[PDB]
RNA sequence: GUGUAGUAUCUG
RNA sequence: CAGAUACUGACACAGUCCCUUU
């Protein structure tokens, strides 16, 4: 007895989620990428509404998914990495109102497996490589360009791998027109398996790896490795170049910290706490998300926690070293797995578990009531949540 | 010799193979499959009310040392 | 002592918590009505008569090389990504014929002695008859 | 080559650069030495493709004229996942008629 | 040891190589004293035989990774045996030489080297000052060339003689040449180590230092410059003061480094230095004549320099000096100039460029025609005759023709040249069907059997464009032309008569062929019993294409006669002539029956010779394939309870190739094979069930997908007792079935099988068992997952996966 | 007709 | 340790010399 599988209703799961200008013109449009399923939809900026465009089916599971543009460009393109053990790199097509391939290339084999590229890809800021890495020993790196025909191109990959090393996250070093830098979170474990007494299992700190792309001998060494004091589950990456300075914010557990590679200082400061928790006080406190409005005049930073609360980062500096980060409360809204900050005062949130949401900015949050934290004070901060008073809901799907 | 390709891959054993690398090799693949499918890590974080955040930092700080120290 | 035979197999990719065989629009017939935990309900339907089972797997095998996933991957690999597919035949590509070039669609057509419309019309009719 | 158990296959990575194959086995399987059903391209190595060993035939080392192939059981079986098929041993029964046949 | 070290030396290649095998791995039981000291002085025997040498070192081979500790003592008296080994001009004879110095290298250590053969360094002989560098090179290659750097960084630094610059530089020259690619990683490190010797005071290491410089340039062709950059000054402000053998050095070190340059570094100096590389076109040397020539080639190479300024300069004077009727004396020059005229044309134009040498085939030499006339034929074969206009094409046309016409000696370039030329143009040359056409009749009657192949070969190649040409008339009047020249006696000319034949019969229909089939077939039977490997091989090729679509002219009384005739034809020699005598016989039993056609295939199985049993059995598949599976099958099956046993394998190893021929269409006639495979995998010779488990493999691999594993798991029950085998081939046929049934039936079945006996108190089974696991291992790693079994806990270590008893 | 690996059985 | 007789791997057959330089 035959069967035959046909559809009613489309998942719905939010898992990934990035924006930019995929069409062309000075629009923004928003690429959510369900399970299985890729999805495209804008936003009306007159009256708010969301309208959807394409819902095509990929037939494989995403496990990463990144947006790019290459230099002196206007149309963005995206990089996924899935569970096919290839990498693919998509383009929209506004005449036939669908996608289209572009680059293919294999290396390796198929499934969900240790050593497999495809978990963690990264992406030049200025658009020049990319590197897509395993959870172990399977680093590997593209070098993207252009040529006289004005299409993409891809080189050989170049390996980078380390055997006994496990990556939390890789994130892309913003450099102003130098050689690519990539910064990965390895932890060795050699040692962790010869001494049966298990002392070593503890006391192992994990390091921020630096890795350094020679774009003149086509080859990728490590340069720096430095030990931290306590775990971290992901990073932020900071606008450098020319617009604000280089470097990293590490979102350890109950702390914030920011490390930069040569000579200078580490800022650490205690993530503020809700008033009057009823909870045990015995749990850490750890960020899920974050976002980045990088703008010419000035450039901010967002997280959530647990609880769901949004907090507005800002670093203060005078030419290079950064001297002490600004904490502050913005909002309170159900937690989510990403979201994307959107021109004209936009803000897109997709919670993990429910409705989705669609907020506008009235205010930017100057010269308000509650004050600022910062790490120049020393020594457990307190805040006192409230309504929302500086967002409002017009939408929800 | 058939046994080049072999030898390049992680998790191959031999005939001198203890038990207790065979299975730390078991549950880290398992533990590196978690995060891989989006339901199999759904259905953990609606199992305990947690966040897939936590859940995902728990799965990689238990990769370290499972199955205990060795013997 | 006495074990059970396997008639079927398949891999939807996502887990499902639900089963249920009910009718779904007045004058349908028995489906197979499931939920995902992601938020899709799908029907397993079977067939009627044995001449459109041959013309199914036949459109289904051709746009298994005809129209290669978006991401790249075997996708009878992805439906025995755990065990052998067995007597199912997937919906969602055949529906996908819908969404191509004209020549492709020709081209494609043009094996079985059959017009685009002609396809599309039966793909659209099994779809509104059991729900 | 199957047939004989002494030459090394390479497994370094993928690339570019297509292998080509010559007139005296034009379609052959790289691993299978098969006669049916060509399926995907074969990609090789930067390191075996530099100067004198470029567009050289992967099996035997002659002048290639025609693209490679893998069967279409190598793609089911997915083992063109494994890098370069191009041979870096010159062999033993290739390597000595020649001086069998110098006298 | 004495007796069968001269029982190889010496004896029948059966003996030899039964008596190979106990000097092996029996190394270190003598030790590296007693066998080398015996083994050394014989090759120490002045004037040994070629095939002597070989064979005393392929011994090496197999007994140096035996002792990896016990080669240090006389490391020295070993190689000085080996240096003048890898220096001969045979290309097999270095290959013995350098891939066995670095095995003794990666066993061995560098302590002992460098101890020993520093002091080989000033010696006055050149011989072993050129031998040297490579020594170090071949070692250098192994062991990792990052180790070797800081010895190297003094070598050429030492103030004793210019002997160990030279040297050193040396080295690192051949580094770069043997090495490729691989030094890009640390180019920088080693250029600054020889950078030091461009301005040395002394016209004896410079040069070595710019080939050096040029070596390491060529090696990264597309990437580094930028550690190229404090060595242009010395390379650039030394050319003007250099004057003789010096300053061709600096030219070819000069030549390979304007590629790596941007679109401004190349194209300013590109002119500075081509005021040298004009006045340099006159010398009364060679050697430096063709290195100018390819730093010209080089320049033109690039994406800075442009057109109309390249046009206005080089070519005047390239074009005065260089064409000339001395050139064709050495054969360098030639293939220089040949290479390096393609470059001009592929840049600034293809007309401009062959308009100059159209007017000069007219000419009384021959040598000067053969060097232009390839040169044309690549300039044409690249880009094309979009460009060409109409005086230019006749002239090109006049002068091939002229050119063709007058020939003198046996070149195989006119032939290349005439039909590149014909092919571009396409269908510009109907006003010269007929003059060609009549010379290469003419040239073909009355000849001394020396250019009728020719003409025959031309026509071949020509074939295609009269089609488009709309002259079928000369076609069919050539290819009734070509009937009567069957009968000639000397080979070469009736296969290349065959060849034309058949070009003319596939560019042509088959019912429009002005001589019938019908006189043709029986006159073409009689070919195929000659045991010249050239006739048949472009015979058959002919009978076949007339068998595929000629078919339906001829009645089936006369293909018995070529069903006989094809049986002696198996009996040849290259595999060329054997793949399609096979495709034959399935080409023909569509039109006349896959009975008594098959019937004469199976008789063939008994002729006691493993080439011809394969090869009907290969006929056999093919003809079951191209008609229908099931009309053959029980004629096949009933072939197999004769006692005898090749026959009884024949059936066996058809039903592989049956069976791999047909892929999806296996899922009907699964169930027929199963009473027969179910005996074979039975406790009878090893040839049945080797054979037997390919027949599963591809069985399995055919119905992959299609849910037909009922059967296939019942199959599963006899592949896994033929495991615990010894044979390589037995063994490797069952791993391979396994391998085939584990994506058809899935691992979970695999699984249970394999971990059975992982753990078992014994080592020969764990040592395949654990095989077995990591071949299922290896594929399909993710599906494992929801397969592996449960283990309870033991006192203290946490066994059980928890995260999956969870429940919603 | 020859060469290049591998395997089985009787006898000394 | 050797001899003899059978067998397997669609094994290959002047293969040609393509930085060896003055
Ligand atoms: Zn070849
Ligand atoms: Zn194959
Ligand atoms: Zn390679």
Redesign the interface.
Known sequence: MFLYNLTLQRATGISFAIHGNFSGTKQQEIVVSRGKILELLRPDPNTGKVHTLLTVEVFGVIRSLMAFRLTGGTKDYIVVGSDSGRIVILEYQPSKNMFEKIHQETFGKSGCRRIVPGQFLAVDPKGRAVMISAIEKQKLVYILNRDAAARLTISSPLEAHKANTLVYHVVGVDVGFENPMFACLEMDYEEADNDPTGEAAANTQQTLTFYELDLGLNHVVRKYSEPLEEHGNFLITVPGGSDGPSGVLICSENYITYKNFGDQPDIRCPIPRRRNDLDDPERGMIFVCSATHKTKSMFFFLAQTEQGDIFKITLETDEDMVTEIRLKYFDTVPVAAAMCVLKTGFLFVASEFGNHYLYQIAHLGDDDEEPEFSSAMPLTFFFQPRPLKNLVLVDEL | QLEHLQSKYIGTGHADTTKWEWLVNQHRDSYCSYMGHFDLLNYFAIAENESKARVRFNLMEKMLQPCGPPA | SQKAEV????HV???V?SLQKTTLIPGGSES??YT????????????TSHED?DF?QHVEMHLRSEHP??????????R??????????????C??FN?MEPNKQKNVSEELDRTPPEVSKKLED??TR?? | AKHHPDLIFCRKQAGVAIGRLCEKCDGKCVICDSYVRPCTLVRICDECNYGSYQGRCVICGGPGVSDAYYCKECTIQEKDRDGCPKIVNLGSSKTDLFYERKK | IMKLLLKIKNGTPPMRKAALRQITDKAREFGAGPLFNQILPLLMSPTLEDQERHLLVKVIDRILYKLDDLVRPYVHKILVVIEPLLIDEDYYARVEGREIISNLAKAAGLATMISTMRPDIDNMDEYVRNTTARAFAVVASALGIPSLLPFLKAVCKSKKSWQARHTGIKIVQQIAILMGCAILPHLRSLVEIIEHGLVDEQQEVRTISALAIAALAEAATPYGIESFDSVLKPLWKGIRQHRGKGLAAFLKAIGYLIPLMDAEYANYYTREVMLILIREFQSPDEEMKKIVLKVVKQCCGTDGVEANYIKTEILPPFFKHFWQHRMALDRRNYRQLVDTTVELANKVGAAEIISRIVDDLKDEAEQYRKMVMETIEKIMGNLGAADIDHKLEEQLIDGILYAFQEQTTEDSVMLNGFGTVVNALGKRVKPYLPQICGTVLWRLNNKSAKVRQQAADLISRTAVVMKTCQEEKLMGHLGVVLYEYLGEEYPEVLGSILGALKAIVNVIGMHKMTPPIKDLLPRLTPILKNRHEKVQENCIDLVGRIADRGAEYVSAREWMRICFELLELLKAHKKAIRRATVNTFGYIAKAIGPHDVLATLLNNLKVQERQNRVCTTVAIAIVAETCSPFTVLPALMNEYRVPELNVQNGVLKSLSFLFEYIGEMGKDYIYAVTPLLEDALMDRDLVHRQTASAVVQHMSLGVYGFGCEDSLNHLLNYVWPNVFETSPHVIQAVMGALEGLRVAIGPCRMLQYCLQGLFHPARKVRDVYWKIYNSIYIGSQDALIAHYPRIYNDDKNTYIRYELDYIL
Do not use: W
């Not at chain 3, 008639?7 to 398949?10: A, D, F, K, L």
């Not at chain 3, 996933?69 to 992805?78: A, I, K, N, Q, V």
């Open positions: 008639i079927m197999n398949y990719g996502e887990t918590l197979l009505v995902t935990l992601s938020g899709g309900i799908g029907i397993l339907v079977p067939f089972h199914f996933p978006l991401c790249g991957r075997d996708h009878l690999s992805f025995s990504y755990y065990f052998p597919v067995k007597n199912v035949i997937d919906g969602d590509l529906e996908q969404s099994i779809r059991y729900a």
